[PDB]
């Protein structure tokens, strides 16, 4: 039994939704600039499942035109503002990382309604 959980309490965010891969959330950040701190969003699809509470690296694939670009967001960081579920996907795998090398007919995601 270990005090890392008592040190989780003072870092862990509570305003956080439930997510799975293929979900869309629109991630917001202050671009890490320490001066004027402009807010910017990033659009993409989740390719992450976090497994635990505070150990959430939150990987997203940008997609944009239909394929490309990968980023980790660390959504419990003070450099990150918010996420809110825009649509949900459907998965039969943990983090669904094959979306880096498959498209379309082979990676449809769907919504499943279940």
């Amino acid at each position: 039994s270990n005090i890392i959980k008592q040190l989780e309490q003072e870092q862990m965010k509570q305003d956080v939704p439930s997510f799975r891969p293929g979900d869309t959330v629109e991630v917001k950040v202050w671009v890490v600039e320490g001066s004027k701190k402009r807010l910017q969003a990033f659009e993409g699809v989740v390719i992450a499942i976090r497994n635990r509470g505070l150990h959430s690296a939150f990987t997203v694939r940008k997609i944009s035109n239909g394929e490309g670009v990968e980023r980790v967001f660390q959504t419990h960081s003070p450099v990150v503002d918010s996420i809110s579920v825009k649509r949900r996907g459907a998965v039969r795998k943990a983090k669904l990382y094959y979306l880096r090398e498959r498209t379309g007919k082979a990676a449809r995601i769907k919504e499943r309604l279940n």
Partner: protein, 209 residues
């Protein structure tokens, strides 16, 4: 300088809006209750012993039990002796407080490294090995040659071969204190400190930063 005995319990990172993670090593400090202060006759130098928790004393032999009897047979992880320059401190129950690490940020930490068993002939020196393609006999993972033919006829003491690595008594002297709590005995220091979960650590104020 006084030394405070404690235990490594893991790592976290402290977080910032600045864009720096600041990894911290998480330490639980002992109640360093004090059981001896030297001088007022004998030794000629001023030094202190802390006593570090309790052990089963049912158990414990008389040569150690007569050395704890002034404070009861607790002892725990050991006594740990350190010099304390010109301080007028009393010999029992003086209970040295960790709260100094809120005023001083520079600290020196001693502990033990990774338990590796074998040390490794390469991994103690990290020397480049001989080629593994097209041959090599029994020697793909050794730190080159330990000597040469034909005149020397010996291998010298001080040659970079074999040695001992892992479970070593190791010091770090570039630490910066991020938090201390005297009631919870909780200490946070910037960066990685040698050892693993449950490893014993000793902290003292540093002389430079």
């Amino acid at each position: 300088m006084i030394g405070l005995v404690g235990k490594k319990v893991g790592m976290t990172r402290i977080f910032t809006e600045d864009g720096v993670s600041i990894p911290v090593t998480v330490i639980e400090v002992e109640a360093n209750r004090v059981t001896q202060v030297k001088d007022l006759a004998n030794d000629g130098y001023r030094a202190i012993q802390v006593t570090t928790g309790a052990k089963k004393a049912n158990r414990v032999t008389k040569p150690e039990a007569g050395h704890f009897a002034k404070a009861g047979v607790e002892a725990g992880r050991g006594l740990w002796e350190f010099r304390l320059a010109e301080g007028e401190e009393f010999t029992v129950g003086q209970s040295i407080s960790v709260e100094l690490f809120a005023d001083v940020k520079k600290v020196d930490v001693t502990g033990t490294s990774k338990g590796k068993g074998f040390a490794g002939t390469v991994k103690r020196w990290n020397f480049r090995t001989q080629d593994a393609t097209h041959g090599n006999s029994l020697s793909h993972r050794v730190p080159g040659s330990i000597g040469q033919n034909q005149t020397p006829g010996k291998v010298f003491k001080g040659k970079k071969m074999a040695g001992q690595m892992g479970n070593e008594r190791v010091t770090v002297q570039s630490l910066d204190v991020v938090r201390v709590d005297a009631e919870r005995n909780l200490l946070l220091v910037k960066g990685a400190v040698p050892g693993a979960t449950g490893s014993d650590l000793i902290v003292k104020p540093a002389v430079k930063a």
